[PDB]
């Protein structure tokens, strides 16, 4: 079953104290009114970022796992809470498919929902909302820690009564900075035409009228390459496939130019015992140019 | 390459660049002469030893086999790159081969990425699938370090101080000492390395625990929380006005 994310996907993009200004920010964000998986444990993809929302009063879920292979002996970020302190580690502790060495990093330090934003060095944001489960009101997240790892991540997992996960998207967002300096309202710049107008006019009030806002630039469906027929091929066969050839002293030099250099037979074919060249790629020869070439044949 | 965090301290880069031991010392986006008086949020030191001929490629924007598949800097990097001859302490007679480097990979390395995975490189048409052989080269290739070779093949020790100059509470602040807090008068203030002129006055602002300084619509600093005391300040510019003769 799935649930909507009414207005979640905005954190504080910067550390400055902004006040009384409609400020524009662009970053990876989760679009407002987007779908999340209403999970009641499994493995999920990771594209650019992740959002998280946990429904629990007893701290059931305390950590996460990350990485590409997500298997033992593979570098993974491990955040864990031991009920006495919270630990952040990069130790790939042995984990099977459903978990309930070479340690490199270490760090030890119903009523509410925790919202987490991840992106890639690593970033973390969160904030808490003491509620008497998801109100549709404004949501902004405060950065927590940005601990670097310098490693590729394309997937992740969870540690272990429900939670919500949603994927952030590249977008443009605008913030109503008040006198108080916090965030009280933000409007998407790609949800609905009124919102796009609010952003382009850069205000929360639009007086009646036509307003040109942006463009409709269609994207291409595919990329086409067209050229003349492959004719004509150089006679490399004559030099290579010659039954009779001239001896090492009497070698035949064949000048070659104005030819389609089909290097495929030379290197795609594995029959030839030695294919040696220095300063030029044996596999990329089709991608290089030579004005004039000569060929010598002997035994 | 190992990454050692440098933070929660005070630094002195003047001795580091002045010393004659550093035959190579190149700074990008900052000039060393004024490193002493500007503070930084975090400094990263990455240590790795490269062959001599490939020092000049490791710079933002440049490529090369190690520059591409082994270590690469952002094209917009800020900081300094440091290198020097290391035959004396590292290279041993008879050949030093305890060092390796990755040469062939399917994809290039994006900024600050480290790869130590150990699978063969598939270069041929047919997948190797764990077979070593023709067109199946393991990516790691060792350095052949003989203490007598030419400097072009000699080992240079390298550390990259990537100065991450960020707007955040800074940690490594440089040697320059403080001066007593001044208020309600025109002064050339300098907090955490931001050079400014204006009158300090306490503000009504309340910062979020990670918040450091505010801003104005014209991208001019308008408030700062004092570094050694949580003093919210208002950087009002000193009075000025046009004068016209009659």
């Amino acid at each position: 079953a799935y649930t909507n994310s009414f207005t979640r996907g905005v954190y504080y993009p910067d550390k400055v104290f902004r006040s009384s200004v409609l400020h524009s920010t662009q970053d990876l964000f989760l679009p407002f009114f987007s779908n999340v998986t209403w999970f009641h444990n499994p493995v999920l993809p990771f594209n650019d970022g992740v959002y998280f929302a946990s429904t629990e009063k007893s701290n059931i879920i305390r950590g996460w796992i990350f990485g590409t292979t997500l298997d033992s002996k593979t570098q993974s970020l491990l955040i864990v809470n031991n009920a006495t302190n919270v630990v952040i580690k990069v130790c790939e502790f042995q984990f099977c498919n459903d978990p309930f060495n070479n340690c490199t990093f270490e760090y030890v330090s119903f009523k509410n929902l925790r919202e987490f934003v991840f992106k890639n060095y690593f970033k973390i944001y969160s904030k808490h909302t003491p509620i008497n489960d998801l109100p549709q009101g404004f949501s902004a997240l405060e950065p927590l820690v940005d601990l670097p790892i310098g490693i590729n991540i394309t997937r992740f997992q969870t540690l272990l009564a429900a939670y919500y996960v949603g994927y952030l998207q590249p977008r443009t967002f605008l913030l109503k900075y008040n006198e108080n300096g916090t965030i009280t309202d933000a409007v998407d710049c790609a949800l609905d035409p009124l919102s796009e107008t609010k952003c382009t006019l850069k205000s929360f009030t639009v007086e009646k009228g036509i307003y040109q806002t942006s463009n409709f630039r269609v994207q291409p469906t595919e990329s086409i390459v067209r050229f003349p027929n492959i004719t004509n091929l150089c006679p490399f066969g004559e030099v290579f496939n010659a039954t009779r050839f001239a001896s090492v002293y009497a070698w035949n030099r064949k000048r070659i130019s104005n030819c389609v250099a089909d290097y495929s037979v030379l290197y795609n074919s594995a029959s030839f015992s030695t294919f040696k060249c220095y300063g030029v790629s044996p596999t990329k020869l089709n991608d290089l140019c030579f004005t004039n070439v000569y060929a010598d044949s002997f035994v | 390459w190992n990454r050692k965090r440098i933070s929660n301290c005070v630094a002195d880069y003047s001795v580091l660049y002045n010393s004659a031991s550093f035959s190579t010392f190149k700074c990008y986006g900052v000039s060393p002469t004024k490193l002493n008086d500007l503070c930084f949020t975090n400094v990263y030191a990455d240590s790795f030893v490269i062959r001599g001929d490939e020092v000049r490629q490791i710079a933002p924007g440049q490529t090369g086999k190690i520059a591409d598949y082994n270590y690469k800097l952002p094209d917009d990097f800020t900081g300094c790159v440091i290198a020097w001859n290391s035959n004396n302490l590292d290279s041993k007679v008879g050949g030093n081969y305890n060092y390796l480097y990755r040469l062939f990979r399917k994809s290039n390395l994006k900024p600050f990425e480290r790869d130590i995975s150990t699978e063969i490189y598939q270069a041929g048409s047919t997948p190797c699938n764990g077979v070593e052989g023709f067109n199946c080269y393991f990516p790691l290739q060792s350095y052949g370090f003989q203490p007598t070779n030419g400097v072009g093949y000699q080992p240079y020790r390298v550390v990259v101080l990537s100065f991450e100059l960020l707007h955040a509470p800074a940690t490594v602040c440089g040697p320059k000492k403080s001066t007593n807090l001044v208020k309600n008068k025109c002064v050339n203030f300098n907090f955490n390395g931001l050079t400014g002129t204006g009158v300090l006055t306490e503000s009504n602002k309340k910062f979020l625990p990670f918040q450091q300084f505010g801003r104005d619509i014209a991208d001019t600093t308008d408030a700062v929380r004092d570094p050694q005391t949580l003093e919210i300040l208002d950087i009002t510019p000193c009075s000025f006005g046009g004068v016209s003769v009659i």
């Epitope: 294919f275 220095y278 044996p282 | 050949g95 030093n96 081969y97 390796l100 023709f134 393991f138 052949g144």
Partner: nanobody
Framework: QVQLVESGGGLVQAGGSLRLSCAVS??????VGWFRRAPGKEREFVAA????????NYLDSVKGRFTISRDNAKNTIYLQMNSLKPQDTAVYYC????????????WGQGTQVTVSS
């Protein structure tokens, strides 16, 4: 250049541990490897180690039961045959790489290893 010569190949009983040791000329900067020609099959990988290296890979057939060693002192290499089951008989060879476009640039003429059940 670098030249390879092999020693220590012969007939041994099933389960026997033999010593194959191949000598090289001017080695030190090349990832040495051991290879075998099966009577009915072409050459296949056995073991490979870099200079002063721990980079070890073995085929599943040789997994857990053959290890190679590098002296770095006597200019020769050692491969550990343990309980060699009979169907692993072949002619063994050494090979190494400096800069290659084929499997490996320099090879060893090798020798014969035979096992009787």
């Amino acid at each position: 250049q670098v030249q390879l010569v092999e020693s220590g190949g012969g007939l041994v009983q099933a389960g026997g541990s033999l010593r194959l040791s191949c000598a090289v000329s001017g080695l030190g900067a090349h990832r040495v490897g051991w290879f075998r020609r099966a009577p009915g099959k072409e050459r296949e990988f056995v073991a490979a180690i870099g200079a002063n290296g721990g980079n070890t890979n073995y085929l599943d057939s040789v997994k857990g039961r053959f290890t190679i060693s590098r002296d770095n002192a006597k200019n020769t290499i050692y491969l550990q045959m343990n309980s060699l089951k009979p169907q692993d008989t072949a002619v063994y060879y050494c090979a190494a790489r400096d800069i290659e476009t084929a499997e490996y640039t320099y090879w060893g003429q090798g020798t014969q290893v035979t096992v009787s059940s």
